[PDB]
């Protein structure tokens, strides 16, 4: 968890891109793994899941 | 896909020295760069 | 993938254009310089004739 | 936190050498699969990069598969060809085979030393430039002179004399001048290979937009886009327009930058700071990705055909380890020397 939160702190998205079919479960795929880290909704889901666990 | 004067073409092509004319550009990209630095000089 | 490679190349070209244009815009205009050169040439010809 | 305690004279000495290690040079194999790292102590490590990037990866896979003593003094420069690994060490260039350096033999092909002024210093070789379109190699270092060597026969053809102090870096842009060279004297010089003369000189410290007299005048890094130039080091990280020699934009950073390169549409930089600096060409700081070293001296994009899986950015500097970036926002892992 400290390594993953370190990655989240160090990536620093800093994103008007959203101004320009629903995926229900997580997509546990080896090949993607970076299109999800570039998104903010995925980070919101993981941080909310941490807060619900805590 | 979000991004941020001029010279007549024959006058530019016939007045500039061949160092700044860049006869290998006869691509539009290097052509516009040749127009820009010719306007600067 | 092919369109986004072409898009980032065009974006680099636009940034090169902006980089040259910002340096050009630290210098004064072209046509106004031609007008004041014509005026200074006429005044210099008159002063040379008087001299 | 102190996991491994050495407890022994040999292992304490090895921990002291690892603690005081500087990694100067990096080279990539003709395939993507291998990496080569030069050492402070004249050693060379060989990194199985495809084995490190594999799904099956052990903690002992981030170790040199072959490390070997190769030079008496430090290894300041490597370069790689279609078949060879050229390494400039003490004052001379050795050549190694990629097929044989993995084996137990590890013999050299040749040993070439350029002619000098016979001063009692044995000067260094800071930059190796591998020139295509003709089998050649440009040597530059503490002799303050550019030497050209044929790759087939060990004969030295051209000697170029323009700098005052020694040279840090070389460049190539495939036009009529085609060779940039930057040095400790503070001037980027252009060297036409046909006439073997100097055709243009850009003094970066003379321009008041770039000067910064506190750090001094020394040019550590150059880069070419065949029309542009990025010059950095002592004065400032500056974007020059060639054929005009005008400072277009300045990249606002305090630490001196030891290396620079062109990405697809970014500018990568590294220096006395800890992080890798990602700039936009307009002059906006896009990112700063922290590395494991206190300072970095070398970046390498591993853009090689026939191995797309070995497409990473490798960084090295004042440490005994190499940071590997599989993505440009975070480090994936680090290879111990």
Swiss-Prot record, chain A:
Expression is altered specifically during apoptosis and is accompanied by the appearance of novel forms with smaller apparent molecular mass. Ubiquitous. Expressed in various cancer cell lines. Expressed at very low levels in normal breast epithelial cells and highly expressed in breast tumors. Expression is strongly associated with an aggressive phenotype of breast tumors and expression correlates with tumor size and the metastatic state of the tumor progression. Induction: Up-regulated during cell proliferation. The modification N6-acetyllysine is found at residue 25. Component of the THO subcomplex, which is composed of THOC1, THOC2, THOC3, THOC5, THOC6 and THOC7. The THO subcomplex interacts with DDX39B to form the THO-DDX39B complex which multimerizes into a 28-subunit tetrameric assembly. Component of the transcription/export (TREX) complex at least composed of ALYREF/THOC4, DDX39B, SARNP/CIP29, CHTOP and the THO subcomplex; in the complex interacts with THOC2, THOC5 and THOC7. TREX seems to have a dynamic structure involving ATP-dependent remodeling. Binds to the hypophosphorylated form of RB1. Interacts with RNA polymerase II. Interacts with LUZP4. Belongs to the THOC1 family. An intact death domain is needed for apoptosis. This is THO complex subunit 1. The chain holds residues 264 to 329 of 657 of the full protein.
Swiss-Prot record, chain B:
Belongs to the THOC5 family. Component of the THO subcomplex, which is composed of THOC1, THOC2, THOC3, THOC5, THOC6 and THOC7. The THO subcomplex interacts with DDX39B to form the THO-DDX39B complex which multimerizes into a 28-subunit tetrameric assembly. Component of the transcription/export (TREX) complex at least composed of ALYREF/THOC4, DDX39B, SARNP/CIP29, CHTOP and the THO subcomplex; in the complex interacts with THOC1, THOC2, THOC5, THOC6 and THOC7; forms a coiled-coil dimer with THOC7; together with THOC6 and THOC7, plays a key structural role in oligomerization of the THO-DDX39B complex. Phosphorylated on tyrosine upon binding to activated CSF1R; which causes a dissociation of the two proteins. The gene is THOC5. Ubiquitously expressed. Component of the THO subcomplex of the TREX complex which is thought to couple mRNA transcription, processing and nuclear export, and which specifically associates with spliced mRNA and not with unspliced pre-mRNA. Plays a key structural role in the oligomerization of the THO-DDX39B complex. This is THO complex subunit 5. It comes from the Eukaryota. The lineage of its organism: Eukaryota, Metazoa, Chordata, Craniata, Vertebrata. It is found in: Nucleus; Cytoplasm. It comes from Homo sapiens (Human).
UniProtKB/Swiss-Prot annotation, chain C:
GO terms for cellular component: cytoplasm; cytosol; nuclear speck; nucleoplasm; nucleus; THO complex; THO complex part of transcription export complex; transcription export complex. The keyword Ribosomal protein does not apply. Keywords: Acetylation, Coiled coil, Cytoplasm, mRNA processing, mRNA splicing, mRNA transport, Nucleus, Phosphoprotein, RNA-binding, Transport. GO terms for biological process: mRNA export from nucleus; mRNA processing; RNA splicing. One of its GO terms (molecular function) is RNA binding. It is found in: Cytoplasm; Nucleus; Nucleus speckle. Its main location: cytoplasm. The keyword Isomerase does not apply. Tetramer; as part of a THO-DDX39B complex. Component of the THO subcomplex, which is composed of THOC1, THOC2, THOC3, THOC5, THOC6 and THOC7. Component of the transcription/export (TREX) complex at least composed of ALYREF/THOC4, DDX39B, SARNP/CIP29, CHTOP and the THO subcomplex; in the complex interacts with THOC1, THOC2 and THOC5; forms a coiled-coil dimer with THOC5; together with THOC5 and THOC6, plays a key structural role in the oligomerization of the THO-DDX39B complex. TREX seems to have a dynamic structure involving ATP-dependent remodeling. Interacts with NIF3L1. Belongs to the THOC7 family. This is THO complex subunit 7. It comes from Homo sapiens. The chain holds residues 103 to 153 of 204 of the full protein.
Swiss-Prot record, chain D:
GO terms for molecular function: RNA binding. Keywords: Apoptosis, Developmental protein, Disease variant, Intellectual disability, mRNA processing, mRNA splicing, mRNA transport, Nucleus, Phosphoprotein, Repeat, RNA-binding, Transport, WD repeat. The modification Phosphoserine is found at residue 176. Gene3D superfamilies: YVTN repeat-like/Quinoprotein amine dehydrogenase (2.130.10.10). It is found in: Nucleus; Nucleus speckle. Its main location: nucleus. Transmembrane segments: none annotated. One of its GO terms (biological process) is apoptotic process. Component of the THO subcomplex, which is composed of THOC1, THOC2, THOC3, THOC5, THOC6 and THOC7. The THO subcomplex interacts with DDX39B to form the THO-DDX39B complex which multimerizes into a 28-subunit tetrameric assembly. Component of the transcription/export (TREX) complex at least composed of ALYREF/THOC4, DDX39B, SARNP/CIP29, CHTOP and the THO subcomplex; in the complex interacts with THOC5; together with THOC5 and THOC7, plays a key structural role in the oligomerization of the THO-DDX39B complex. TREX seems to have a dynamic structure involving ATP-dependent remodeling. Belongs to the WD repeat THOC6 family. This is THO complex subunit 6. It comes from Homo sapiens. The gene is THOC6.
């Amino acid at each position: 968890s400290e390594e993953v939160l370190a990655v989240f702190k160090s990536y620093k998205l800093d994103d008007k891109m959203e101004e320009l079919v629903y995926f229900a479960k997580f997509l546990t795929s080896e090949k993607l793994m970076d299109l999800q880290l570039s998104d903010s909704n995925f980070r919101r889901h993981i941080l909310l899941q941490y807060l619900i666990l805590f | 896909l979000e991004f941020k004067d001029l010279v007549s073409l024959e006058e530019f092509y016939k007045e500039a020295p061949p160092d700044i004319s860049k006869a290998e550009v006869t691509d539009p990209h290097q052509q516009t760069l040749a127009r820009l630095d010719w306007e600067l000089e | 993938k092919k369109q986004i490679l072409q898009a980032k190349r065009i974006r680099k070209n636009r940034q090169e254009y902006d980089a040259l244009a910002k340096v050009i815009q630290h210098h004064p205009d072209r046509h106004e310089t031609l007008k004041e050169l014509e005026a200074l040439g006429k005044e210099l010809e008159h002063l040379s004739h008087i001299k | 936190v102190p996991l491994a305690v050495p407890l022994g004279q040999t292992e304490v000495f090895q921990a002291l050498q690892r603690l005081h290690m500087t990694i100067f040079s990096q080279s990539v194999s003709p395939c993507g699969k291998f990496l080569a790292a030069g050492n402070n102590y004249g050693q060379i490590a060989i990194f199985s990069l495809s084995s490190a990037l594999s799904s099956e990866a052990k903690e002992e896979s981030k170790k040199p598969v072959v490390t070997f003593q190769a030079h008496d003094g430090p290894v300041y420069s490597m370069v790689s060809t279609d078949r060879h690994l050229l390494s400039a060490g003490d004052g001379e260039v050795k050549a190694w085979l990629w097929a044989e350096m993995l084996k137990k033999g590890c013999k050299e092909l040749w040993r070439r030393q350029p002619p000098y002024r016979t001063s009692l210093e044995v000067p260094e070789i800071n930059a190796l430039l591998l020139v295509p379109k003709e089998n050649s190699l440009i040597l530059a270092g503490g002799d303050c002179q550019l030497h050209t060597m044929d790759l087939e026969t060990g004969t030295f053809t051209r000697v170029l004399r323009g700098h005052t102090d020694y040279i840090h870096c070389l460049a190539l842009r495939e036009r009529s001048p085609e060779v940039l060279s930057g040095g400790e004297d503070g001037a980027v010089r252009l060297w036409d290979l046909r006439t073997a003369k100097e055709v243009q000189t850009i003094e970066v410290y003379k321009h008041e937009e770039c000067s910064r007299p506190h750090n001094g005048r020394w040019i550590g890094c150059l880069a070419t886009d065949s029309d542009w130039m990025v010059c950095g080091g002592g004065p400032a990280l500056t974007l020059w327009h060639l054929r005009s020699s005008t400072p277009t934009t300045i990249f606002p950073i305090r630490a001196p930058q030891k290396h620079v390169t062109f990405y697809q549409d970014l500018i990568l930089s590294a220096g006395q700071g800890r992080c890798v600096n990602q700039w936009q060409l307009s002059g906006e700081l896009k990112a700063q990705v922290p590395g494991s070293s206190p300072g970095l001296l070398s970046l390498s994009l591993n853009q090689q055909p026939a191995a797309p899986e070995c497409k990473v950015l490798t960084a090295a500097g004042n440490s005994c380890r190499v940071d590997v970036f599989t993505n440009l926002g975070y480090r994936a892992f680090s290879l111990s020397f």
